Write a protein that binds this DNA or RNA. Structure first.
Lengths: 51, 88, 100, 117, 55, 271
RNA sequence: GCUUGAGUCUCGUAGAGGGGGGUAGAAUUCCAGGUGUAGCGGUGAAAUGCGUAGAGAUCUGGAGGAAUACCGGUGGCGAAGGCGGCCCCCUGGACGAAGACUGACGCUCAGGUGCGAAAGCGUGGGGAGCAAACAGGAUUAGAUACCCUGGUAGUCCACGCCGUAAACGAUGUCGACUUGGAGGUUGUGCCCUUGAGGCGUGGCUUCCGGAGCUAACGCGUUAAGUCGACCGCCUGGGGAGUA
RNA sequence: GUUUAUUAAAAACACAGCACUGUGCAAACACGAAAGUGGACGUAUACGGUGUGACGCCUGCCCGGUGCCGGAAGGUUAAU
């Protein structure tokens, strides 16, 4: 949302613009409510990746 | 559940010796006490199949122990039936 | 007979009647053979969200061992008292370092 | 001009269209502009430039009131969020707060199953 | 044993938005994560801890 | 929960027996009883005004405490009794002062347990409280349209009005049809919902079941000649005009509400 | 007779196990108001739709019904189906330490009985989202579809019925034996209470893997290995789980 | 079961059951020039009206017309 910062800024930016979890949870809340197999698919992929 | 003090009274009343919590009379008496409590539990709303499975398990294990008591010694079996009011 | 932890928040405008509140509730509890372990009046406290369009509420915690019947009628009194805006009755929450 | 001179810009950046509404702190709307009304329709509506034109249009819409500082309330997953914010500080209003007010439910109502293909 | 009254301790495990932190991040054991989750949900009920940042 | 009814006869085929063992078997309370002489399609003028009302079993009326006074005295519930006048059952209540009354029967009945309405009350349906004092999200019944009037809404079997909060002076009520009506917060309320929902499950089964209930036959207008009803005539089954009442107004659609004093209170109307 | 199988007792431990009742918070929709004014919604692009009768946006007050974001994890629990907010009441099971007790009371089980997702059925409620059927709009040669705007039964609750699923680990239940490694979860003993640090010992679980087995893929101490008890089932494919 | 007493007892009317619509209580609706009364000493699991007529399978399409429901952009609109 927003974290406490000093009112004068060197330049007007947001620190966590592209890292916000809001966009991802909005994309998952919109449609496609499977939620059963992707946990196992993610776990098998993660176990393959970790060596 | 069966209370500790009720369980101790059952083992002291139906036990041929003290600390005989394992005798067949004591096991059948404890099982009957839980049957009589669970009947009042299952009077209300009667949809608890999961607890009813444990209830039917107490019934079945009681039947096996009473059949064992029949084959081993019939005098004790008839006395236990007369004490707990079953198989009328 | 049974250990319980009771926390209730009171509307800020009704803050004058909370010592009488805890006195009558403790009296009912002690009449029902209960023992009060830690009667702590937390006092007024800002709330993280508004409930019933109020922002600051009185708080008091009781931590009583008592029978289930007196705790259920206590819960009824909490539901029917309009000063209590929310009340929670927990499980044993046994004897630990008091005043937490 | 207006005496309070403080406002909030609500950026409803949906996937198709971005609506920018500058209101006061009490919620009463002073002005609004949209990506469809900015002159871009169809595929260009979703693009970040359309939201920039929407922000500039609402900026000149509330230039009558003399808004000096505006907090920013951002809703939605659309491409127009950061573009609308940038176009507001380009329009020269001081941005005092940037809050992400997207309605994130709890497990909530059932989502639409549509667009499955 | 994690008490909901210790909102000072639970603030270390809530995020800025009010969410319960992941155990893979804070390194709590599974048992203390579950007790922490129950305590946060109780304190959220008592309004000691906020449900979300906005409200 | 339902005892089976064999089809020994047509007329016994369709009705299946749904009864309550908790209902009292015996005479009703005589102080709370008065006569109810049937007035079947009658008037002071003597004419039929409401049709299909007629011959049935004699019913004696029971005084039911729609307005719940005697507050401050705990009421112990007794065995529930059958009320032929209303759809739901009635419950005997004995207060600590000795006053015996009839109320609408709550869902829960406790035998051998004292019932209290003050400080020592439990979480039990049937407790009376004003609309200001109801809990958040609570369902109430026997609520009053005017403060001090008596019960007007949710007095039937299985009917309840749910309320979450209040505006401050007028509280909105979600009725069973779906209408939303603001009544004053001083109006009384009885917590929970009324029983005897299971009683409505069974079908009547025969013509004589309705004729016991007091319902005389309904003749369709198409059966009649042109003069008895606007529908009616011809050598075939259908008259073939727009659906109307015997006096001419449209049956289908055609909203007939004309009250304008109460339109401010009824902010929302059901479809 | 015996205690080594199976069981009982004491003390604890973890858990979306079940049933009942209460409450909280987001969010969606609707109703009434405040500001406000030409678009909104949607899509591959469009259109139906909604909107100058003032929508969409934003604020406030209220109503209602569902699922409980984060925690959340090839985590836990349950015989399976399955079970996720918090709280209370009622209850089933597992597991661990130290002993005590009973003394084969055990295993399986055709018939039989019970539980059995979702959809469906009956009666009565409820109905916010979603949505079979249905309507309109688009794509196409056509499109009784995929896409869009709607939308009823249903999904929700009480009681009763069905008795089916790719109900799967496509792997029946019980007991014994047979190299290891990395983990997750829950007990417990000791040292160094002294780094939720070292050393053990149980229960469930995930992955890889040796011998062995298999037609191969793979399984592999939770076997598809080596055995024993008992039950169910199969005997080419369509016809056919049909008459 | 009821029905044209006195040429028609039926396949007619009714009937349980089913749907739709109205109706938030001083309720709709009805008899009343009105007071009043019935509905109802009932409260949407209730009432009234319409059609169908136990039970099993179910109830297709078409809102162009008429009717009803909702909105009054715009026009045309009475007394005043």
């Amino acid at each position: 949302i927003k974290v406490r910062e000093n009112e004068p800024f060197d330049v007007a930016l947001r620190r966590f613009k592209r890292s916000c979890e809001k966009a991802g949870v909005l994309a998952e809340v919109r449609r496609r409510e499977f939620y059963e197999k992707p946990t196992t698919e993610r776990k098998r992929a993660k176990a393959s990746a970790v060596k | 559940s069966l209370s500790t003090e009720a369980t101790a009274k059952i083992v002291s009343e139906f036990g041929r010796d003290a600390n005989d919590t394992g005798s067949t009379e004591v096991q059948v008496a404890l099982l009957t006490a839980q049957i009589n409590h669970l009947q009042g539990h299952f009077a209300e709303h009667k949809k608890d199949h999961h607890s009813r499975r444990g209830l039917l398990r107490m019934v079945s294990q009681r039947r096996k122990l009473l059949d064992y008591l029949k084959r081993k010694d019939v005098a004790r079996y008839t006395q236990l039936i007369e004490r707990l009011g079953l198989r009328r | 007979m049974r250990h319980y932890e009771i926390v209730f928040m009171v509307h800020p405008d009704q803050s004058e009647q909370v010592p009488g509140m805890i006195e009558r509730y403790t009296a009912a509890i002690t009449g029902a053979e209960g023992k009060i372990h830690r009667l702590e009046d937390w006092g007024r406290r800002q709330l993280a969200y508004p409930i019933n369009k109020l922002h600051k509420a009185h708080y008091v915690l009781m931590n009583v061992e008592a029978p289930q019947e007196v705790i259920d009628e206590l819960e009824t009194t909490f539901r029917f008292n309009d000063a209590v805006i929310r009340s929670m009755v927990m499980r044993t929450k046994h004897a630990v370092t008091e005043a937490s | 001009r207006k005496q309070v001179s403080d406002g909030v810009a609500h950026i409803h950046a949906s996937f198709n269209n971005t609506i920018v509404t500058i209101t006061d702190r009490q919620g009463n709307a002073l002005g609004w502009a949209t990506a469809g009304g900015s002159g871009f329709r169809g595929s260009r509506k979703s693009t970040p430039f359309a939201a920039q034109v929407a922000a500039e249009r609402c900026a000149d819409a509330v230039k009558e009131y003399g808004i000096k500082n505006l907090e920013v309330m951002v809703k939605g997953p659309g491409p127009g969020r950061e573009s609308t914010i940038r176009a507001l500080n380009a329009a020269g209003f001081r941005i005092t707060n940037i809050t992400d007010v997207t309605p994130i439910p709890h497990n909530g109502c059932r989502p639409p199953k549509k667009r499955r293909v | 044993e994690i008490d909901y009254k210790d909102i000072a301790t639970l603030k270390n495990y809530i995020t800025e938005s009010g969410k319960i932190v992941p155990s893979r991040i804070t390194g709590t054991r599974a048992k203390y994560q579950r007790q922490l989750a129950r305590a946060i949900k109780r304190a959220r009920y008592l309004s000691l801890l906020p449900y979300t940042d906005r409200h | 929960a339902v005892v089976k009814c064999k089809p020994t006869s047509p007329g016994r085929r369709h009705v299946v027996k749904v009864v309550n063992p908790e209902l009292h078997k015996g005479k009703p309370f005589a102080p709370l009883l008065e006569k109810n002489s049937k007035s079947g399609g009658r008037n002071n003028n003597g004419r039929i005004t409401t049709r299909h009302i007629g011959g049935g079993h004699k019913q004696a009326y029971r005084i039911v405490d729609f307005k719940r006074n005697k507050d401050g005295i705990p009421a112990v519930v007794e065995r529930l009794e059958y009320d032929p006048n209303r759809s739901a059952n009635i419950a005997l209540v004995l207060y600590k002062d000795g006053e015996r009354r009839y109320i609408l029967a709550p869902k829960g009945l406790k035998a051998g347990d004292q019932i209290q309405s003050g400080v020592d009350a439990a979480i039990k349906p049937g407790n009376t409280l004003p609309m200001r004092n109801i809990p958040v999200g609570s369902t109430v019944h026997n609520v009053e349209m005017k403060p001090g009037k008596g019960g007007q809404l949710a007095r039937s079997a299985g009917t309840y009005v749910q309320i979450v909060a209040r505006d401050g002076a007028y509280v909105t009520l979600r009725l069973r049809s779906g209408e939303m009506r603001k009544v004053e917060a001083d109006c009384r309320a009885t917590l929970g919902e009324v029983g005897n929902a299971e009683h409505m499950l069974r079908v009547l089964g025969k013509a004589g079941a309705a004729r016991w209930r007091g319902v005389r036959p309904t003749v369709r207008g198409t059966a009649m000649n042109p003069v008895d009803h606007p529908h009616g005539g011809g050598e075939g089954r259908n008259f073939g005009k727009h659906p109307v009442t015997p006096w001419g107004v449209q049956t289908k659609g055609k909203k007939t509400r004309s009250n304008k004093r109460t339109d401010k209170f009824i902010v929302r109307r059901r479809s």
